[PDB]
Design a protein around this ligand. Structure first.
Ligand SMILES: NC(=O)c1ccc[n+]([C@@H]2O[C@H](COP(=O)([O-])OP(=O)(O)OC[C@H]3O[C@@H](n4cnc5c(N)ncnc54)[C@H](O)[C@@H]3O)[C@@H](O)[C@H]2O)c1
Ligand SMILES: NC(=O)c1ccc[n+]([C@@H]2O[C@H](COP(=O)([O-])OP(=O)(O)OC[C@H]3O[C@@H](n4cnc5c(N)ncnc54)[C@H](O)[C@@H]3O)[C@@H](O)[C@H]2O)c1
Lengths: 237, 237
């Protein structure tokens, strides 16, 4: 079936917990060899070890995605261990509400963490994807990227930039055989949140991971440049 | 796995050819009992017979989706044949370039065919989907819904209303356990088209059917109100 990742090699960032952990484990179960990375070296090792215990192939490494030396070490470790790179999941990111008069370093950090990092990791992975005959990049954005609200100058604008980068670089890397899509996750684990969620329950990490698996699999081979919101039907961030 | 449709009953409209035919055959392979419907009675029967011959469960019926008597008969036949309805794929639609000074009968027909039909079928299916424990509605839209161009007054505007209807009614039926999503196909089957298509190839019916299966399966149980464009990375109609 096209919904598997047979013979894939997937790098997942921010994968020690939450969404990134669920994607790592789901991708391994679907047949991918997984390079599990996280800011915290022990958290990444834990998830890679759990994947190996369950029968999958995985290694875990420390990677601060804002550190160019860490980025290059992940690319090299994927190639040394598994010989190619075909999938990159840019899940590491962060931030949140901040006042309009925030220090400029806070505003700039949001772009370094949420945007400059993945872009650079996309640059680093793309030639190896092309040489492997194609691949898939997946960016984890945020519903703040399409929404408008108070205290969102840095978080909303940096995640919107992730969305627009996704749509644009699909044109650049399509001819290399590479698809690029994004997922905007909703609230993943109260009564207030449920009032704005038509499906009436909070999201699970597995919900994001199932959509990630689709967008990174051959079942989505002709889908690129899309931002898919996984929110239970809700629109409010 | 979450990408199967076991014990589902899916109504697919406009399913004698093209995208609807691929959805019907794909959904049956994934486990659904399929009610194949089309304006052309004999085309729908041929597709259902091929599904049965491949080992699936299907019946074929005539249904002009613009005819309220046909819409009621299809709902009743799905319940009479399989006892429930859990998936509705509103694929029947049409239209195309028309001059700005078109007869009003042409302008209104685009809304009768592309929008009023699917709204009514969604109304008729929804109470049965709730009694069956929940369900999924999938609307087949068009990239003309979000694009802007000449000669698009009726086709572009009516397909855009489908996109917005999808997002809005997800709020209404979410509490009934029903998800509503749309797929906007691009160029599904030249040099000019490929020039604006990053992935370098024309779209196939099976590309739409693979996305349809994802969005109607438990793998997308917390995805609603989305419009997924399947276009090879392209943005132009
Ligand atoms: N606003 C929203 O709607 C929303 C909601 C949830 C998640 N998200 C996005 O999803 C992604 C994952 O978030 P989450 O909620 O699962 O986070 P989480 O806190 O559950 O886990 C994040 C993981 O990433 C790691 N990490 C943090 N900074 C890092 C860095 N610089 N380099 C590498 N790894 C790092 C952490 O150690 C942690 O293990 C993020 O991009 C986040 O912005 C957005
Ligand atoms: N604009 C785009 O980019 C684009 C491209 C492809 C498809 N689409 C959409 O996808 C859907 C299917 O398109 P396709 O290319 O597979 O069409 P198709 O011509 O291959 O087949 C469509 C089927 O629908 C049936 N049909 C026509 N009118 C009907 C009616 N009133 N009631 C019931 N059935 C009817 C036909 O008999 C035919 O079997 C349509 O909604 C179409 O608008 C849009």
């Amino acid at each position: 079936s096209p919904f598997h990742l047979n013979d894939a090699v997937a790098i997942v960032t921010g994968a020690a917990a939450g969404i990134g952990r669920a994607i790592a484990g789901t991708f391994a179960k679907a047949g991918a060899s997984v390079v599990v990375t996280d800011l915290k070296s022990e958290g990444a090792e834990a998830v890679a070890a759990a994947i190996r215990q369950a029968g999958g192939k995985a290694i875990g490494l420390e990677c601060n995605v804002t550190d160019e030396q860490h980025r290059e070490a992940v690319i090299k470790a994927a190639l040394d261990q598994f010989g190619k790179i075909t999938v990159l999941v840019n899940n590491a990111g962060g931030g949140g509400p901040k006042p309009f008069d925030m220090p400029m370093s806070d505003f700039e950090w949001a772009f370094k963490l949420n945007l400059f990092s993945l872009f650079r990791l996309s640059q680093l992975a793309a030639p190896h994807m092309q040489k492997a005959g194609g691949g898939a990049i997946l960016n984890i954005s945020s519903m703040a990227g399409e929404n408008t609200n108070v205290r969102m100058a840095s978080y909303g604008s940096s995640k919107a930039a992730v969305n627009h980068l996704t749509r644009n670089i699909a044109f650049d890397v399509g001819p290399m055989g590479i698809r690029v899509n994004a997922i905007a996750p909703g609230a993943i684990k109260e009564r207030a949140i449920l009032k704005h969620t038509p499906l009436g329950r909070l999201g699970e990490a597995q919900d994001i991971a199932n959509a990630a698996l689709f967008l990174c699999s051959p079942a989505a081979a002709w889908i690129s440049g899309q931002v898919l919101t996984v929110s239970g039907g809700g629109v409010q961030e």
